[PDB]
Amino acid sequence: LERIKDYLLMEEEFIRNQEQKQEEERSKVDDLRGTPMSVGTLEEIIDDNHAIVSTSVGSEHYVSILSFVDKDLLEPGCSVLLNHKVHAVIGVLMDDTDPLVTVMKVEKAPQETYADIGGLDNQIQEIKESVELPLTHPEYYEEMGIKPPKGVILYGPPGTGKTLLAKAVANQTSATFLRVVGSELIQKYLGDGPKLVRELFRVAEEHAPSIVFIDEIDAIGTKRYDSNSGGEREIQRTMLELLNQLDGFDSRGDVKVIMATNRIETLDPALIRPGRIDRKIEFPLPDEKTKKRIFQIHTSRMTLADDVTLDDLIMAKDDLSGADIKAICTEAGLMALRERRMKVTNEDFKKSKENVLYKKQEGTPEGLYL
Amino acid sequence: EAVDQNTAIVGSTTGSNYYVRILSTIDRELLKPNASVALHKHSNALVDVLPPEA
Amino acid sequence: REELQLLQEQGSYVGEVVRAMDKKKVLVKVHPEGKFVVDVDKNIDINDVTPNCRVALRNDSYTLHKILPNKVDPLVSLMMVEKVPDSTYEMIGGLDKQ
Amino acid sequence: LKVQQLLHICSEHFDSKEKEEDKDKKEKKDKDKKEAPADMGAHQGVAVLGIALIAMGEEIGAEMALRTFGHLLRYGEPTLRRAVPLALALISVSHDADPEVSYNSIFAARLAAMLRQLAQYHAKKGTLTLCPYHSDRQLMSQVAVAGLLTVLVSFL
Amino acid sequence: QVEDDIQQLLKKINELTGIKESDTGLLAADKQTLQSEQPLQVARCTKIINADSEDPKYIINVKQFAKFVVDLSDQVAPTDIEEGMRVGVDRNKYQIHIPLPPKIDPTVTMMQVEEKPDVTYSDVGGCKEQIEKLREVVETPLLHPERFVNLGIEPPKGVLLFGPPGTGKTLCARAVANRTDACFIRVIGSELVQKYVGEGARMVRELFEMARTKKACLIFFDEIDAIGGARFDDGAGGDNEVQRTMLELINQLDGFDPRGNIKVLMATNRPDTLDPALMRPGRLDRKIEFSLPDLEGRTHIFKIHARSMSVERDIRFELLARLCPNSTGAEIRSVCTEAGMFAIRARRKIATEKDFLEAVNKVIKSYAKFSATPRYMTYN
């Protein structure tokens, strides 16, 4: 019945978003601007009211600035406004908001907040006092005078909540978030990794204080491809550029760098040392008690009967995850729409239990061991 | 391309591409996708469709 | 026929509109060339400024003339790169479980 | 119905019944505060930007509020540039001192200096907190008026 | 139909409020200078091949267009219009105005440091020999040529560094930059990793051409492994662009009227796999290395990382320095910050030596022994 208000508010939102002389000095500045206000690119800046620009094809001129828009806006490597009549620098153009920003700079606080955890409440406090407390309330670093910890490593079994905590820090945020999957850092060219590193972390450093999260970074040391030029003597160069990027020079900035791995053994000891990463964080599969909290949260907004005990789903399997319990919930929903019911009963949980423990955790064809 | 009557887009062999107009001398069937066409110097508007050559 | 010097009028430029900006101003990448903030006419529509649309741009003063139709077809281009076997239900007989 | 009355008589040519009549909003919709972001900054009757500048106020002050202090922090009239640090540092009772040193970047008038001092003071439906800032709403005046400026006793 | 009602009609009241506002809506700084600068000139810049004899008769390609025989305007310095010197040329008359400094690179000017980080020699404690020899190499001849030239001896142009990761190569390099008094230049060793062939040659070119113009400058290389280890030979053609980049760096480094007044500090974490062409001296003289903090230099690093925090005065430092023989100053920094964070976990304001106990017995156990995990006795 809530479709009425949904559609009406959506249409009102769109129409009010689509709702977007007196000044003669501004019109005189308009008339100092050309009618074909051309666009160019800077090379260098000379103090004598004019600098050197470059055209599209490569003509270059000493052209002056319409000085009501500031030249401190101008940096080498910017797109400007040029004239046709003396080609003079007209003004500042809004920058090329490149697809690195539109892909990586996630504007959205994604999903549920710290009430979507399971088996947490120490590591939440670690990532809180290591990222949020340097971000939101760093008055205690006045009170003592100590550096904040720098790097964070999330490691454990697959399906533990690396993804979940990454979405959690991006939920409660006030800084620009960046996300990289660690398998992207090999391309079909010679020397494309360091270019990615430099432009990525330059865009990270240019806007604001920020958070860079990279995940499955272990996919660069123990992975080979036929889609690879050079090879290990370019993987090492990619690693070495990121090595100089992370623990380099020149006051790196308020950019919290957070990493997340499945395995930990195949990683550079020069990259887990502090200076780079100060807060290594264990993710074990925590306890058989907060299994019930994940069953509670992942069934907090679905109608279900009583009909089950979670102790029946505690004494079934020895390794525990949200990847277990959410799979149980989704397969229970599949068995529910399979039998066109609601208020999910026990037999859906039992068949879902067996089919999820089989698919997948067994290892390996019999036998072995048994 | 052909927008409509008395208006089309042709790419001349200067490499560039022009919003132009067509004449009523051209029979409108000889546009089909792609014809060798004739233009003007100053105004650079279509004058004629050529027989298959080039 | 005396009014055929309308056809003797100077040509025009086909370009690429990224997106508009403030004070009734727009942007055009022409055919080989860079970006040119160009001025709007009166008989045109700012409310039809689409991302990546060809428009008729005059050549002398770089004033907008008209909207050019039939823009790009990019997904159609990748589809024609593919040429997958287009199908329906009547041909995958012998099995219906999957 | 009085909010669409607010919509129509908000457009009244006398521009001080605009000030208090539009200023009623932080009293009215104080609980459903997600609608409380409005386009008062997108309007031009500069006292209206003052009204939204009041309407944020002092509670805990989320990132959207400080984001509105991104633009409201930067204005040139000394009563409105005066008007921003008061509710700006009421809404937060570096981080906290970062907009303060940003105000040092704004000026470095005397009013602005006084406003900065007020902001520093701020940095460090119960009716008792509802009265004294509506008592403060005629601030564009003498220091004789500011002799009573220290009577907005709304904090423990 | 409680929260449904709430969201639905509250957003509807919002939208209806917005509808009547959508309906209720319906310089002198330098302008005269700019109109005086329409009588200014376009001044296209160019490049010079060569002059002629007894007369200017300058031969110029612009950058792209063509090549021209031009003549200068009479407002020039008629001497300094030499070859390869980028000059501004008139549109119509093709007349030359003023030479300006040339193309540097699109993104290699962007590695001069342009600031000075506040890393100080006092923060690099425990390496007093390294401190004094680095002082002798870098700080003394570039600021006080008092003893070297006046007896007639040379200062060494080259110094190498390595050691354990976390020892202070970063500290010493940034620590010079507080008291540099020189044009310090940062060079990542991975900067020479480009796509196109022979580009690193151009990189070494423009590095040393930035080095030559401004005098008495510093260039810092860092992680010179990627610059190249050796001169491998095999029937497949592997490390080549890196190899030619490496040899061009050797040549335009030194040889055949060498560098001049530049000091280069080199660092690596694997010096054993370096070619002897870099290792032979003259190119790099003092092979200064780093060891672990073995003694009360550890306690001095404790005093550095503790002097910036209000602590309990009843504490010692040598006890934990005994408990960390092999440790690095980065690990010391992690322990000191971690104990400070333990004190901030508490609502105190001053730490304890037991907070240092927490930091030691948490870091060196949890994150020097659980990575990797043992689950087996076999040993003890």
Ligand SMILES: Nc1ncnc2c1ncn2[C@@H]1O[C@H](COP(=O)(O)OP(=O)(O)OP(O)(O)=S)[C@@H](O)[C@H]1O
């Ligand atoms: N003797 C020391 N005194 C104080 N801080 C130290 C000391 N040694 C190391 N550190 C700290 O450790 C870091 C020094 O940078 P390093 O980690 O040494 O960089 P690096 O030497 O280039 O190692 P790489 O990059 O792996 S070759 C900073 O966090 C310093 O504060």
